[PDB]
């Protein structure tokens, strides 16, 4: 579990809110709304509402930046998005982790929400707790215009400057949430607190 960002629960404030999860269109399997859609068990619209998207059909580019509404809650000093998912052919824990839902989950984290179940094998159909890495506001952050922390998976030869350009994140604000340089977050989710739901450069 090597991330520099720590996704603990706040005590300034509610344990459970409303938040956004960026999300990246894939190359073969993740070019609509409608099949992203199908692992967040929620509408391509509500998807296309907050990635500011104008054509909801409207097929997408690999590495097209998304955002999916989310909802956070607290679970043993941490916060999660619980979010259920069905076993497909050839699915494990470990996969889904790094392909389906992109790094925005660990092995670790998916095992441990479900404690009972296999993570190597497990039979069709069979419904899933996906525990997605997200934060609430301290209330400090919501004194503030802070209302959304968004949890975003750090690429590879990215920059402050370049990430909170493009959520409209004021950067001491997007440092003070997560306090490192950046430097070892790669594949790895880290936390952009926005005042408000960013206007998305789309095709
Ligand atoms: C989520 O984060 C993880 C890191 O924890 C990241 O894992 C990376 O996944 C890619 C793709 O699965 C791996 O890339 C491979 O690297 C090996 C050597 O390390 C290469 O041999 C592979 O080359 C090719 O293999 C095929 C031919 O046999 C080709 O057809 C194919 O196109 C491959 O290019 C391949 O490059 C990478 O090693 C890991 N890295 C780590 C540290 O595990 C994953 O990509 C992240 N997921 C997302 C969606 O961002
Ligand atoms: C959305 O996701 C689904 C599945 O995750 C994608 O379905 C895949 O679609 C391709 C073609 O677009 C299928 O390939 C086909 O294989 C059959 C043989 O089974 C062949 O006869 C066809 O000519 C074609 O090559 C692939 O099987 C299918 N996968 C599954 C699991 O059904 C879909 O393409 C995705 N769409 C977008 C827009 O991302
Ligand atoms: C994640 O959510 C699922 C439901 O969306 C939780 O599972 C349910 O738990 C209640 C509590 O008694 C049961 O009545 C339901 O039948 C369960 N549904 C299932 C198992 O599909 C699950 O507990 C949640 N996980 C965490 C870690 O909070
Ligand atoms: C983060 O994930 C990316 C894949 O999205 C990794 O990039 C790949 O790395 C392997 C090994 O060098 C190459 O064979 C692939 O061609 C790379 N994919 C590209 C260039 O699109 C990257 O290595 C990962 N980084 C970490 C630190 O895990
Ligand atoms: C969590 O906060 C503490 C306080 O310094 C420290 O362990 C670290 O900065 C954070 N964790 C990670 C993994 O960066
Ligand atoms: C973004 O930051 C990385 C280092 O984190 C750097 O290598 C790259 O040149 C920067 N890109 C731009 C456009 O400044």
Same mark, same amino acid.
């Given at each position: 579990?090597?991330?520099?960002?720590?996704?603990?629960?706040?005590?300034?404030?509610?344990?459970?809110?409303?938040?956004?999860?960026?999300?990246?269109?894939?190359?073969?399997?993740?070019?609509?709304?409608? =099949?992203?859609?199908?692992?967040?068990?929620?509408?391509?619209?509500?998807?296309?509402?907050? *990635?500011?998207?104008?054509?909801?059909?409207?097929?997408?580019?690999?590495?097209?930046?998304?955002?999916?509404?989310?909802?956070?809650?607290?679970?043993?000093?941490?916060?999660?998005?619980?979010?259920?998912? *069905?076993?497909?052919?050839?699915?494990?824990?470990?996969?889904? *982790?790094?392909?389906?839902?992109?790094?925005?989950?660990?092995?670790?984290?998916?095992?441990?929400?479900?404690?009972?179940?296999?993570?190597?094998?497990?039979?069709?159909?069979?419904?899933?707790?996906?525990?997605?890495?997200?934060?609430?506001?301290?209330?400090?952050?919501?004194?503030?215009?802070?209302?959304?922390?968004?949890?975003?998976?750090?690429?590879?030869?990215?920059?402050?400057?370049?990430?909170?350009?493009?959520?409209?994140?004021?950067?001491?604000?997007?440092?003070?949430?997560? =306090?490192?340089?950046?430097?070892?977050?790669?594949?790895? *989710?880290?936390?952009?607190?926005?005042?408000?739901?960013?206007?998305?450069?789309?095709?």
């Amino acid at each position: 579990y090597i991330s520099e960002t720590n996704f603990t629960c706040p005590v300034d404030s509610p344990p459970s809110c409303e938040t956004y999860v960026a999300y990246r269109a894939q190359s073969p399997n993740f070019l609509s709304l409608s =099949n992203i859609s199908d692992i967040f068990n929620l509408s391509p619209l509500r998807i296309a509402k907050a *990635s500011n998207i104008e054509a909801e059909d409207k097929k997408l580019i690999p590495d097209q930046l998304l955002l999916v509404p989310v909802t956070c809650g607290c679970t043993k000093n941490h916060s999660f998005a619980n979010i259920t998912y *069905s076993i497909k052919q050839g699915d494990n824990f470990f996969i889904l *982790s790094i392909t389906s839902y992109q790094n925005l989950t660990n092995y670790l984290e998916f095992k441990n929400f479900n404690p009972n179940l296999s993570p190597t094998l497990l039979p069709l159909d069979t419904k899933v707790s996906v525990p997605l890495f997200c934060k609430c506001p301290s209330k400090n952050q919501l004194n503030k215009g802070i209302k959304y922390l968004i949890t975003y998976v750090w690429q590879d030869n990215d920059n402050v400057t370049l990430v909170s350009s493009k959520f409209g994140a004021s950067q001491v604000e997007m440092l003070a949430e997560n =306090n490192h340089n950046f430097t070892a977050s790669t594949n790895r *989710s880290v936390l952009i607190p926005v005042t408000s739901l960013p206007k998305l450069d789309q095709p």
